[PDB]
């Protein structure tokens, strides 16, 4: 069972700060990993997959890195509509796992 923990509550950040959210995995998953932003009133919404390739309609000010077992997600220039919930998620599609790919939050930006 590959497990991503994400036991990290996010720190208060101002406009223009940089945040390092770190998602670590027990088993090696390759590069297959996704990230999502969850605004607390609507459906979830994806930013980047395979830790390097961003989706359409998303600005290039979000970053992606990390390989092997640990991965990250950084960005700078925090707007007003970045108050949401974040989630890292693997794609190893195994059978005997109980993933839920959980963890991740983000404070209201001052």
């Amino acid at each position: 069972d590959p497990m991503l923990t994400q036991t990290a509550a996010s720190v208060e950040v101002a406009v223009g700060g940089t945040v390092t959210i770190k998602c670590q995995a027990s088993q090696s998953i390759g590069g297959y990993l996704s990230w999502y932003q969850q605004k607390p009133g609507q459906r979830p919404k994806l930013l980047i997959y395979r830790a390097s390739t961003l989706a359409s309609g998303v600005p290039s000010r979000f970053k992606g890195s990390g390989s092997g077992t640990e991965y990250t997600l950084t960005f700078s220039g925090v707007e007003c509509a970045d108050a949401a919930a974040y989630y890292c998620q693997q794609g190893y599609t195994s059978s005997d796992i109980n993933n839920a790919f959980g963890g991740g939050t983000e404070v209201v930006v001052k």
Binding site: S28, G30, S67, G68, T93
Partner: protein, 466 residues
Amino acid sequence: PVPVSKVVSTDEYVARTNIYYHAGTSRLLAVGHPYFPIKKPNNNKILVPKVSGLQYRVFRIHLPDPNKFGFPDTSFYNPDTQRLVWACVGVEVGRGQPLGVGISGHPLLNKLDDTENASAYAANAGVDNRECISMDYKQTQLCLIGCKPPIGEHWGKGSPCTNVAVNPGDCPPLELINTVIQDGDMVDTGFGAMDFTTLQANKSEVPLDICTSICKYPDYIKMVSEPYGDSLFFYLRREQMFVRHLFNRAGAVGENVPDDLYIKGSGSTANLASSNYFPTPSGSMVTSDAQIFNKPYWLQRAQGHNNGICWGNQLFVTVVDTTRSTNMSLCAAISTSETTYKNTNFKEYLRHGEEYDLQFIFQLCKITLTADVMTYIHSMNSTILEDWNFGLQPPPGGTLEDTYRFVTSQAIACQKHTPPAPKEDPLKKYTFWEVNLKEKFSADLDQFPLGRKFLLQAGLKAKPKF
């Protein structure tokens, strides 16, 4: 004093007598499974062996040395300063099974879809998209005669470079490796001469007869350019292969295609299928017109410097045949008492037959031994004079004293009996088919099927009886 630093063909230091000899084995058979060996579920012991049409077939010919011959005529040579050696003039590879072909496959091949006529775009993969496909192989026939074993090449994996860091998932590295052909090596099947053990990680690329073994193509330009010409006297070849089906690879592409190669698609064609393809080979019709075997081969001059001389009293014959590879398909019932046909009443098996003949003619050749010639044979292969009795160096010895008589009990120098075990020859780490031609010689040519074909090549009928 005047040692030469050239290579001399053996027509200058070997004489040719008049005395011919005929040999021949009986016939060679082998029976077993064509795909994989069958062993018991617990030990390593094989219940049946694996014999197929595609595997190589190397015979070594154990000869008896002619200096041990007691000739009634003691005038044509002198055992003071001469040695005797065999020379092959006629070679025959006879086979007797009927012609035809044989197919193979895999229960789980790993093809995504056909690509030759696609009606629409392909769907996504999912997990476990294996299939069961079988096909026929390329057609190959060869025959090489040599004093030393055949030298083939195959692609394989070497060590990557230590400056840059590697990760799990990189492309394996590649290099050429020259090896020695044994019996049981597979021929190339049209999937190229590459190892599939260390380079096919998913173990489901090719059909299973070559899935966990090296296939080797014989290296020609290495063997001809070898000095002394001992690797081959001559060879023969006829190969043909054409492509039948065109499938798509299933699995993650390593490097994506660069974006300047294609205008970017959208809609359902936003993404790409797997770019790489692999073909399906097919051999065309066999015939009795394009055969190689069942006809003799008289050699006049070999291509190398060795004009057919058997040093060490051995020679190596290889042959690969795929025009006789039909696998018979038996089945046996557990109970014939039933009225109806139920498909759980029968077990199925596969068996493959194979049949051979070898027939030779050897000529008797002698060597005058001058000290100038003695260093030349000392230089090309030093084990020849050790296998004769000519290599001389005397140790005098100190006449060492024997131990106490009691020996077994209360001896002071106890355990003085200690065995050395140096009794070893080279070439014994490799295993392959041997024959025993020690007791099959004859001097009467007219009592044999090849021997009448030899005299018609050169006349000299000798049979007055009336």
